[PDB]
Amino acid sequence: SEFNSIVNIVKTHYPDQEYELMENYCLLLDPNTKAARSALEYADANSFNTLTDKLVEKMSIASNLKSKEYGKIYEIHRKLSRGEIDVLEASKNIGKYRIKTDEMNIFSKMIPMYDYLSKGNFSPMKSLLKQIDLNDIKENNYLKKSFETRIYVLLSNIYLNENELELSRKYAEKAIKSTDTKRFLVFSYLTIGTSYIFSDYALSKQNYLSGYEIAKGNSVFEEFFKRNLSFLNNFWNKENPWINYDSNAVTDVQEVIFELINQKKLERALTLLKSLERKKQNENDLGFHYYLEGLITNDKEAFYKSVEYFKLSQDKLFIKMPLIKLESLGENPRLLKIISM
């Protein structure tokens, strides 16, 4: 509780300069100490990338064994997040390296989960989670606590994709009470926001707006809320100030295209949707792609196709969008239920 005392001081007494103060104090610290090891978490759980990358360098080449470990493991995690490497090579590098610390045993498991979630590839997550135990960490109480929040958040997403919405919110809410890290707060609110998309427009917007407030300041955290607010509004067919028209990202384009649909410009929506079709996209994105086509043409093939991609993606929340459409075209309700489950 050296590091912890330092962070708690800055957080309370100098709040709106936290990053300036904690940068200096982190970069000064000796790699070998617990504080430096504790600091690495602070840096990464906050997504302060440059600072995390700097701390990695110092710690990768260091006398203490634990610090050497942390350096090497976060080295992988940050190569994975920047997308220098794929999931498969990350899994090999954890298998190759021999993990001695109980903490880095726990953190190694969570490494791929981040990539899965980003890539829409939801199938592997559930199984990977069950093995982890948080009492295997009983050494460094700061690293123990942030990992609690990390797991509460990851599960909040896992149950979201499993279409266990009451549970998703439970876990996000847990995460919120457990932390005052912005990023964890940001993603808690994102996931509660997402959990209500179909349930209740109002509560979705509340949770997405409340997170949006916390996110302002950060270019990257804003973008998630803006994208989800676009989606929310386009799906409920409401006024939509959230759209970014100057983005090539398939998910921003997808938001444009969803907007024209709501404004009934189906020729222009069709043209642009065909331009996305062969572009690089994860399967979950194709889930939406064909759902969009289904709205334009009203062809069952599109909706059938959209279901197939969500099925591949194992996205049990968003599979219901094409399934509802298919029900309204007089498809056998029982067969559609079999798909939903």
Binding site: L117, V153, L154, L190, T194, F224, R227, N228, F231, T251
Partner: peptide, 6 residues
């Protein structure tokens, strides 16, 4: 598209 972060 709907994004999810963790």
């Amino acid at each position: 598209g709907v994004v999810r972060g963790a």
